[PDB]
RNA sequence: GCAGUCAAGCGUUCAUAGCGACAUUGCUUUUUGAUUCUUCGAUGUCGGCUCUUCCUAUCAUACCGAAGCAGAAUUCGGUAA
RNA sequence: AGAACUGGCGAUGCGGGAUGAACCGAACGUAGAGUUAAGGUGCCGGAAUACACGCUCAUCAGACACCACAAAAGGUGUUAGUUCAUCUAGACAGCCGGACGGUGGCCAUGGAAGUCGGAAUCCGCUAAGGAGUGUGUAACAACUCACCGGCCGAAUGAACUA
């Protein structure tokens, strides 16, 4: 029959500053800055001093509680994201054919280009959303590291790389060729 | 399927519906190319008359055939395309309800051309003595220019009032076919200016089109009259 | 506006079906009503289900064979106009005239500087709010249908921009013209006011 | 209160009957009702349910009604209930937070109705049984109210218009 | 809160005058029984007076024509009011009860 | 469990697959 | 670390005591009242200090709280309720002005059929006219 | 005619790659029957031709899932007119 | 299709129900005023954008009867209700963690010995350590689990019903 609801508060770390005006919040740290808009029914996720960020709600129902949990998760991700970063480590796999991967960051619209994917004459490329940065530390041509502050964007970009290479028409077990998420994502750094 | 076993595409398209008489003698282009490149020295369109057809021999290209290389014949339509007078800059603005014209900027000289503007374009062929074009209203380019200043504060994709000077050779007819031609190009302020420079003077085919370039042709078909299903559909 | 000759109505965040009920009834009252800010009206419910209903109506508008009607109306002023025809008795001459008395314009039509007004609790904020299976603006429905819309929002953006400027300077000048009471005043008279009404 | 909700009418009576050394014995059902129209009815339905009688064999001695004895306030009524849905009637013990016996009826009706299936034909119930605030077990609305009397918790709960002010 | 809103409500038609030279248009005189408060008339005026056109009884033309007035101005100022009619009323229905 | 989803995913509705397994 | 944050905010809550409430639609009328005792979220007992403000139990949510609060504590009865209005004061005064309230303000206006009273009304603008003038300066 | 449920059973082993009885609930109105509502001051028959518009329970093409998919021919199935 | 018992239609208007012989209200000389039935009150469309509450978010759905469809199966962790058990003595999700000894137990059979089939079921000491939960080999051959402990803190899951 429920609910009605009450406040939850999480302390903001010294490494993070947050600043909020309206429903849109900026979360700022040394890795960089992150903006999202939290807007929802009868919810506030407010900052009580630059000290605590608190979430409170007049109202509750099943729907609200589920939302509050997402809101509480997102924010924890933003805060950790600005200080720690999030990073995905991804590995190129190719059984026959060389996969030629670069990122055209400096000279063009930010995108990751893969060439000769499965012998494909046509280059397959997808953008990078947000300030997240990709470094491919080639070796033979195994390792990709994708690092950024915004958790959403980082996950999307890493995910985008995985979807581009996907071949739905043939069996996956048979054609290993692609890029796969080798990790999730992640620890902090002394650096 | 109740019938036919044994069912075929329907002869004759619904998009070229209605199969009806054109509104005008002269084709009118509904939309034009986009503002990608140089200014209104680049008129979006030009007009001409169909002379007939000829055939030409050319150095081909399509490497895949064995028949590729040497001279090969290709069909041509010849069209006589005289220098055309861009008389004026008409300003159409985008709003909600539709475009309405702010102005037309006139040159000093259309003289027989305005008589041709009077022909069907007004009506009656030397019928009873005039028809009229009002004269340049004691140097009131200022009226035209202040109205030009108005077009620059927004945006049709800047457009021009044009005519074909038909008298040149093949047509016994003298009368000009007035046209609305869009101007496309670079930034808007320079776009008004170039369009402005162009009206002062005639414009050739050399200014508009380069050779070999891809051109869309719009014209109005041969007229049968009234016809049955078999030839039509 | 609630008189006999005005009549200008604010569409911003109002309920489409609700605006149309009162609008029809006032046209039946014999007013000539100008419904303004057409793109900004909202009709509640998720867009997907709303678009599915309209999509069938578009699919209907694909035929008969013939030409000359039926129709599905692309645009926010047009959607709203369709809404009145259904709301009013479309059979009769009275009903027909009432329909001729509507004009719906998107953004603002040529200057009506005089304020467009909200109707007695017509607005979607309160009228959602438990809540909101989503809520859909007419401008959001019509981007998917096609474009009388594309030019209308383009003008809305320019109208709102121009007007927003005006309103800031207007308000500044008004509080300024106004500081009358920032109290002066008392002057026996204020006692008169308190009494004068009072008794 | 104003325009009822179902004041319980303590209807009493007899039976009252025949030339035999028998006679039926003395009864009560205290039934929740709107006045005498309902009063009669329930008695005949009770007389059908448990007893057996008749109409004529059941004789009504007297009627005494129902306002508020104890506080408006704050039983959270334990109700023994029966709801008719897609066949016959299924047993229920529903303990819900209420103000009072006037309220209890409405809150139960709304619960049979919405939740459980209910429609016209029904009737009602078997008993309503008061309970101590701390005792109250099943559970959602009341758990919060029990806590409120506690208090602190009233300082809680204090929530509903809350998002509205500014202070 | 309000304003008017409320239905109470009886009145009289005093008489409806369908009058020109061809110059003048049509007038209707209404006298509501006590009603509008002096205040309720004055802050307002534009209260719409709707009389239903029903069967009274025997066969009146029982039609789906619901009639709406409006008060133009008072003439009577505490009582009597001017009205005009626009529509079509049923047949010589001066007398008839005013109402929502 | 494992077998149920396999059959459903292959030919059932998505909603039909989930709940019983749960 | 001067000043802090901000937080989009603030604070109205008081379904309990202290919270003045404004009327919905009902009785043969309308008045002002406060929450003595809380039953549950839905049902609350509402009373007021003196006259005919009789205490009613209602399911509240159609019934809206007003911006005002007065200072007391939870658990009340008649004797306590009388003491509180007396101690608090200025609540009636706030009640007159304007915050969903406006009740006296509307009362003043409402009484005004006369000869004399109307003249007074004209006078207030005649006074506005001279202040407008006074603003103009000349 | 087609579908759904259940799943005995078969498929080397394996209910569900595929095949799938008994039983059972449906749906459609395009075969057949049933009827006798409509027309006996008159509805032109089958079939075919040709012209149109449609339907989805999709044979192919597009995108997809599964496989008893190594490739690869393929099988089954989803979305889809 | 063909009976019974009755009302209506036929031969019965008018009001309701989109239309509509037999559905509801209603049995009708005329005319008017009043007030009502049936049934309805966002607009079309009288007349409420009524009041107290609760569920639902599919546009379900605006439907007595009706060419008003929707079932078996009903999932179901949707919501609700019930019935039985477990929880501040600390359940539950997850993660983490521990195991000596009477002694590898009678029957039968090529062969059961924790775990093919088939018995009794006590006890040490004792955080705790079952003659054992599943995964085995011809049979024997490990490892986990039971049972027991922690990190967290508040409810919990199973059955039926609408």
């Amino acid at each position: 029959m429920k609910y009605i609801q009450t406040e939850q508060q999480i302390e903001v770390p010294e490494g993070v500053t947050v600043s909020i005006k309206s429903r849109i919040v900026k979360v700022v740290g040394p890795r960089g800055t992150l903006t999202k808009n939290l807007k929802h029914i009868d919810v506030t996720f407010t900052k009580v001093n630059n000290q605590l960020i608190k979430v409170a709600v007049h109202n509750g129902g099943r729907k609200h509680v589920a939302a509050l949990r997402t809101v509480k998760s997102l924010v924890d991700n933003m805060i950790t994201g600005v200080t720690k970063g999030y990073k995905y480590k991804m590995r190129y796999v190719y059984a026959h054919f060389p996969i030629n991967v670069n990122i055209v960051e400096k000279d063009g619209a930010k995108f990751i280009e893969v060439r000769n994917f499965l012998g494909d004459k046509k280059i397959r490329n997808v953008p990078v959303r947000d300030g997240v940065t990709i470094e491919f530390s080639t070796n033979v041509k195994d390792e990709i590291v994708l690092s950024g502050n915004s958790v959403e964007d980082v996950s999307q970009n890493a995910a985008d790389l995985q979807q581009i290479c996907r071949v739905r028409n043939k069996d996956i077990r048979k054609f290993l060729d692609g890029i796969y998420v080798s990790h999730k994502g992640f620890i902090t750094e002394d650096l | 399927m109740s019938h036919r076993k044994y069912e075929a595409p329907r002869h004759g398209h619904l998009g070229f519906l209605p199969r009806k008489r054109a509104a005008s003698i002269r084709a009118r282009v509904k939309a034009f190319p986009k503002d990608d490149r140089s200014k209104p020295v680049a008129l979006t369109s030009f007009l001409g008359y169909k002379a007939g057809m000829t055939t030409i021999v050319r150095d081909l290209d399509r490497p895949g055939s064995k028949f590729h290389k040497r001279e090969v014949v290709e069909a041509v339509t010849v069209v006589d395309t005289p220098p055309v007078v861009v008389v004026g800059v008409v300003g159409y603005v985008e709003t909600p309800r539709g475009l309405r014209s702010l102005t037309t900027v006139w040159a000093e000289h259309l003289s027989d051309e305005v008589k041709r503007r009077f022909y069907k374009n007004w009506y009656k062929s030397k019928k009873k003595a005039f028809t009229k074009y009002s004269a340049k209203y004691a140097q009131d380019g200022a009226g035209i220019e202040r109205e030009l200043a108005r077009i620059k504060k927004y945006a049709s994709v800047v457009r021009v009032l044009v005519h074909t000077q038909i008298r040149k050779t093949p047509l016994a007819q003298k009368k000009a076919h007035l046209a609305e031609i869009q101007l496309n190009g670079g930034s808007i302020s320079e776009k008004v200016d170039w369009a402005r420079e162009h009206f002062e003077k005639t414009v050739a085919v050399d200014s508009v089109f380069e050779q070999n370039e891809m051109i869309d042709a719009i014209a109005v078909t041969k007229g049968h009259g009234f016809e049955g299903v078999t030839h039509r559909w | 506006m609630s008189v006999e000759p005005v009549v200008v109505i604010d569409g911003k965040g109002h309920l489409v079906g609700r605006l149309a009920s009162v609008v029809a009834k006032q046209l039946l009252n014999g007013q000539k009503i100008v419904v303004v800010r057409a793109e900004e009206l909202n009709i509640s419910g998720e867009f997907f289900r709303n678009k599915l209903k309209y999509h069938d109506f578009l699919r209907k508008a694909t035929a008969f064979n013939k030409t000359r009607g039926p129709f599905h109306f692309r645009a926010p002023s047009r959607i709203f106009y369709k809404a009145l025809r259904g709301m009013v008795s479309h059979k009769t001459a009275r009903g027909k005239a009432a329909l001729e008395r509507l004009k719906v314009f998107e953004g603002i039509p040529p200057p009506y500087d005089k304020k467009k007004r909200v109707v007695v609790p017509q607005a979607l904020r309160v009228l959602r709010l438990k809540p909101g299976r989503k809520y859909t603006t007419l401008g959001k429905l019509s981007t998917s249908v096609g474009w009388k819309y594309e030019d209308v929002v383009a003008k809305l953006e320019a109208k709102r921009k121009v007007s927003s400027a005006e309103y800031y300077a207007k308000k500044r000048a008004f509080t300024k013209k106004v500081a009358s009471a920032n109290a002066t005043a008392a002057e026996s008279d204020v006692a008169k006011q308190l009494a004068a009404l009072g008794y | 209160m104003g325009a009822f909700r179902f004041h319980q009418y303590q209807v009493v009576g007899r039976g009252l009957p025949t030339p035999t050394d028998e006679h039926p014995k003395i009864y009560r059902m205290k039934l929740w009702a709107t006045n005498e129209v309902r009063a009669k009815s329930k008695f005949w339905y009770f007389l059908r349910k448990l007893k057996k009688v008749k109409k004529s064999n059941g004789q009504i001695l007297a009627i005494n009604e129902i306002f508020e004895k104890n506080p408006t306030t704050i039983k959270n009524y334990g109700i023994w209930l029966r709801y008719q849905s897609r066949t016959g009637y299924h047993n229920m013990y529903k303990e819900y937070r209420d103000t009072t016996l006037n309220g209890a009826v409405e809150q139960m009706y709304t619960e049979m109705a919405s939740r459980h299936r209910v429609r016209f034909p029904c009737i009602q119930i078997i008993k309503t049984a008061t309970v101590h605030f701390k005792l109250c077990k099943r559970d959602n609305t009341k758990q919060f109210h029990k806590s409120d009397i506690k208090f602190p918790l009233v300082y809680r709960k204090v929530r509903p218009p809350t998002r509205k002010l500014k202070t | 809160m309000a304003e008017s809103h409320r239905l109470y409500v009886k009145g009289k038609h005093l008489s409806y005058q369908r009058s020109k030279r061809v110059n003048n248009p049509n007038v209707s005189l209404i006298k509501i029984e006590g009603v509008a408060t002096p205040q309720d008339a004055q802050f307002y005026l534009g209260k719409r007076i709707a009389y239903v056109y029903r069967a009274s009884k025997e066969v009146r033309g029982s039609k789906i024509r619901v009639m709406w007035g409006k008060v133009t101005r008072t003439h009577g100022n505490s009582g009597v009011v001017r009205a005009t009619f626009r529509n079509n009323l049923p047949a010589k229905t001066f007398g008839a009860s005013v109402r929502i | 469990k494992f077998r149920r989803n396999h059959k459903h995913a292959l030919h059932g509705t998505a909603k039909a697959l989930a709940a019983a397994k749960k | 670390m001067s000043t802090d944050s901000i937080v989009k905010a603030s604070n109205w809550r008081l379904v309990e005591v202290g919270r003045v409430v404004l009327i919905k639609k009902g009785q043969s009328a309308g008045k002002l009242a406060a929450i003595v005792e809380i039953i549950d979220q839905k049902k609350v007992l509402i009373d007021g200090p003196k006259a005919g403000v009789p205490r009613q139990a209602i399911n509240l949510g159609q019934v809206v709280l007003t911006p005002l609060t007065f200072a007391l504590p939870r658990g009340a009865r008649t004797a306590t309720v009388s003491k509180k209005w007396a101690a608090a004061a200025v609540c009636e005064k706030w009640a007159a002005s304007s915050w969903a309230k406006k009740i006296a303000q509307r009362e003043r206006r409402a009484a005004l059929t006369d000869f004399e009273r109307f003249q007074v009304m004209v006078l207030r603008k005649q006074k506005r006219y001279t202040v407008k003038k006074a603003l103009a300066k000349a």
Side-chain angles (χ1 to χ4, degrees), chain E residues 1 3 38-39 42-43, chain G residues 23-24 110-111 113 118:
Chain E
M1 304 309 269
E3 283 54 82
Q39 306 193 12
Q42 305 206 339
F43 305 102
Chain G
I23 33 172
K24 223 296 185 194
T113 35
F118 265 79

Side-chain angles (χ1 to χ4, degrees), chain B residues 89-93 101-106 140-156 158 188-193 195-196 199:
Chain B
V89 178
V90 199
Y92 284 89
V93 53
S101 179
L102 65 94
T103 193
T104 208
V105 168
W106 275 74
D140 187 53
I144 262 79
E145 290 295 293
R146 186 160 169 216
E147 297 184 346
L148 192 102
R150 287 160 146 160
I151 166 72
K152 60 184 180 60
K153 290 172 160 173
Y154 237 146
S156 68
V158 200
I188 183 72
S189 305
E190 52 180 15
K191 194 181 299 183
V192 179
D193 196 47
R196 186 240 84 61
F199 75 88

Side-chain angles (χ1 to χ4, degrees), chain G residues 132-138:
Chain G
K132 281 158 56 277
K133 169 253 176 286
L135 292 170
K137 316 288 209 296

